[PDB]
Design a protein around this ligand. Structure first.
Ligand SMILES: Nc1ncnc2c1ncn2[C@@H]1O[C@H](COP(=O)(O)OP(=O)(O)O)[C@@H](O)[C@H]1O
Ligand SMILES: [Zn+2]
Lengths: 359, 271, 48, 53
């Protein structure tokens, strides 16, 4: 017999009738082009520019079923085959890479997920959470509510997660960005990506945006490099100088972070960019205890642990390593094939760092 | 009888407006109307054709300006043309005689107009150099055929069959109403005049023409000494010496004899 | 330039194209004169 | 009627193109957005002074 070549098709009871034939013989398919430049001589015979990629660009108009109330610059429009009059504005695209910076909803983080640094996230909330949820004290006492703050602490430890807890309780859409997502082999557009990001966030019903390694982004000009991987110098000020602060900012909340603050541009440091600065350190003894208290939820263990002694067996250390050690006690269970973790697993998992990372 | 393979007659006088209008509107599907008569069920004849100016809608029913045509028919019937409009035509430059989605709807009105109006398609840019591309169509199995007439014609061409009888429309065989009066009148356009036939061309140019072949005959003479030297009875390949000798001989002799004959006749006439 | 229909040569044209070269040939320096030069004498004269 | 023919034969959607220089033997050169090239013996519905090649 003959072999099928991955042709699809549903069974007969699921298609056709006269509906499909009438639809195909009646409705004109629409080609897709980009829009531009509403000619707008007097705003009742506006006309537009369109671009059919690799084919042409045209001056066109609308079919009266649609109105200029729905057409803007670019706007992704769709027209018919022969007279190319605007029939539909097509929905936005997921290409602009904003999607890969999105969290898009209340993060799975709360104000107790922070490992001891609750002091810092609370002083954070005074400048982002308080001046959106508690505006009864800012403008009456004189100044419009602030919206943006920076963080800097231990090596890549917990910093970003604070933003997630805030965006959770703020009930805010969340975006998180790194310098890499403002960079491509194609140049110039890297600056335009921040412009796109702020615009697409303001198309959301107000949004919270966060940046990491802001040292690599908020770092000032380096002229004496004489070239090299120079794209930074083209893009970074379009953050720093097009960024807004407490006063010039629309309905948007912004948060910064980096492990290295000494190199940051004072322009980021000054207002119009930053409304507060916060410092962190290696988790203190209370902090280290509280991190293990948090992670006792993160596994199934013999929950009689002396976390109070585990946090002290850790000398000056981070809290990301605490998560790694908890998963390492998980490793202890796995290598022993044990259905549950135990205090000995926690102890020698701590020593996995404390001894072998510090022997 | 419900109409069959049938036949359509077009006057030569109608035909030339079909092409002149088409070659005028080389960028556009220019259109117009035909006057004629559904003389009988077996055939329809068209006499006289008037094109009509541009409409921004292109080929369509609204391309017909009712004011213009009504007075155009009014002017025509006054000057002796009482025929009704039996069909409409439009140009299709760059593609053959077939009906598009607008055309079928346009024609569908015309059948809805009286009984059996017929469309005509002209492609004036490939209708060139003696080639003509014209056909007639009508919408609705075509009723019972009673003669091999449509069996004689080539079956609907693929470029038209892709939009052919699946759209329940069919061709009607073209034919021409030329008469002995029109035939010799059109022939008289290119019929030679007496001084034209007695022109002696140019003796110096004749030598140029003579050399243009004699030099070639030197090569084919060498090439004739190649065909005769490969007499081993090998596979067929007419080429090189064999044929090209004979056509060049034909033109060369008729050139010299006629030039000398006309000069000889010129020598006798004028003294 | 050729016919759209038959492509037979309708006309010959002045050779070559380009708006950029036009922009390089249609900018005006304004009104200047050799007397309106700061007495570079020799220099100016050499360029003449 | 001249104006109303011209109006009804603007056709509403139309191509875009880049202007190229003019000539007197008044008549201009054009490059399409389809990267085709054409010569207009008559420029059309715009006077010469609207133009920049
Ligand atoms: N004590 C802690 N509590 C919660 N999360 C932590 C802690 N320490 C480290 N992290 C981890 O840090 C990660 C992101 O924060 P971080 O890397 O510090 O941001 P930044 O890149 O700005 O330093 C999260 O995946 C989180 O799991
Ligand atoms: Zn048509």
């Amino acid at each position: 017999g003959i072999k099928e070549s991955d042709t699809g098709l549903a069974p007969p009871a699921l298609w056709d009738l006269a509906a499909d034939k009438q639809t195909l013989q009646s409705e004109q398919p629409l080609q897709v082009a980009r829009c531009t430049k509403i000619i707008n001589a007097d705003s009742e015979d506006p006309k537009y520019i369109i671009n059919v990629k690799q084919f042409a660009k045209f001056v066109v108009d609308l079919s009266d079923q649609v109105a200029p109330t729905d057409i803007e610059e670019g706007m992704r429009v769709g027209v018919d085959r022969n007279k190319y009059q605007i029939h539909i504005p097509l929905p936005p695209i997921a290409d602009p890479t904003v999607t890969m910076m999105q969290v898009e909803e209340k993060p799975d983080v709360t104000y107790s997920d922070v490992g001891g640094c609750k002091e810092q996230i609370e002083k954070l909330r005074e400048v982002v959470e308080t001046p959106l949820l508690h505006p009864e004290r800012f403008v009456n006492l004189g100044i419009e509510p602030p919206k943006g703050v920076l963080l800097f602490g231990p090596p890549g430890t917990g910093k970003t997660l604070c933003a997630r807890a805030v965006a959770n309780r703020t009930d805010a859409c969340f975006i998180r960005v790194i310098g890499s997502e403002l960079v491509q082999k194609y140049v110039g557009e890297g600056a335009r990506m921040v412009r796109e990001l702020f615009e697409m966030a303001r198309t959301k019903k107000a949004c919270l945006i966060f940046f990491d390694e802001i040292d690599a982004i908020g770092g000032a000009r380096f002229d004496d490099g004489a070239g090299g991987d120079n794209e930074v110098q083209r893009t970074m000020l379009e953050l720093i100088n097009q960024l807004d602060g407490f006063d010039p900012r629309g309905n948007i909340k912004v948060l910064m972070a980096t492990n290295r603050p000494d190199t940051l541009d004072p322009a980021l440091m000054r207002p119009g960019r930053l409304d507060r600065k916060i410092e962190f350190s290696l988790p203190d003894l209370e902090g280290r205890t509280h991190i293990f208290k948090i992670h006792a939820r993160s596994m199934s263990v013999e929950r009689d642990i002396r976390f109070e002694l585990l946090a002290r067996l850790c000398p000056n250390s981070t809290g990301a390593e605490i998560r790694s050690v908890c998963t390492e006690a998980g490793m202890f269970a796995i290598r022993a094939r044990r259905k549950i973790a135990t205090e000995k697993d926690f102890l020698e998992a701590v020593n996995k760092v404390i001894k072998s990372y510090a022997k | 009888a419900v109409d069959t393979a049938e036949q359509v007659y077009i006057s030569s006088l109608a035909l030339l407006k079909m092409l002149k209008h088409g070659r005028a509107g080389v960028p556009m599907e220019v259109m117009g109307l035909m006057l004629g008569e559904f003389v009988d069920d077996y055939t329809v004849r068209v006499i006289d054709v008037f094109a009509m100016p541009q409409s921004g809608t292109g080929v369509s029913v609204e391309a017909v300006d009712p004011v213009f045509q009504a007075k155009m028919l009014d002017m025509l019937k006054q000057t002796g043309r009482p025929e009704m409009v039996v069909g409409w035509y439009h140009s299709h430059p760059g593609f053959g005689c077939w009906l598009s989605g607008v055309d079928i709807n346009t024609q569908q009105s015309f059948e809805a107009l009286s009984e059996r109006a017929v469309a005509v398609v002209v492609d004036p840019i490939q209708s060139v150099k003696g080639k003509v591309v014209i056909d007639a169509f009508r919408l609705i199995h075509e009723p019972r055929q009673t003669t091999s007439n449509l069996g004689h014609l080539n079956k609907p061409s693929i470029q038209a069959l892709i939009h052919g009888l699946n759209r329940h429309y069919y061709s009607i065989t073209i034919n021409y109403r030329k008469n002995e009066l029109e035939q010799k009148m059109l022939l008289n356009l290119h019929k030679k005049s007496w001084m034209e036939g007695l022109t002696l061309q140019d003796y110096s140019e004749h030598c140029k023409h003579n050399e243009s072949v004699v030099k070639e005959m030197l090569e084919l003479a060498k090439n004739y000494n190649k065909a005769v030297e490969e007499e081993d009875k090998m596979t067929p390949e007419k080429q090189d010496p064999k044929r090209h000798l004979e056509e060049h001989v034909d033109v060369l002799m008729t050139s010299n004899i006629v030039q000398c004959l006309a000069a000889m006749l010129d020598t006798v006439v004028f003294k | 330039a050729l016919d759209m229909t038959t492509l037979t040569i309708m006309r010959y044209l002045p050779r070559e194209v380009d708006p950029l070269v036009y922009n390089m040939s249609h900018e005006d320096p304004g009104n200047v004169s050799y007397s309106e030069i700061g007495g570079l004498s020799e220099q100016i004269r050499e360029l003449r | 009627e001249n104006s109303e023919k011209i109006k009804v034969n603007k056709t509403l959607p139309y191509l875009v193109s880049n202007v190229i220089e003019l000539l007197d033997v008044k008549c201009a050169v054009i490059k399409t957005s389809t990267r085709q090239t054409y010569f207009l013996p008559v420029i059309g519905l715009v006077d010469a002074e609207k133009l920049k090649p």
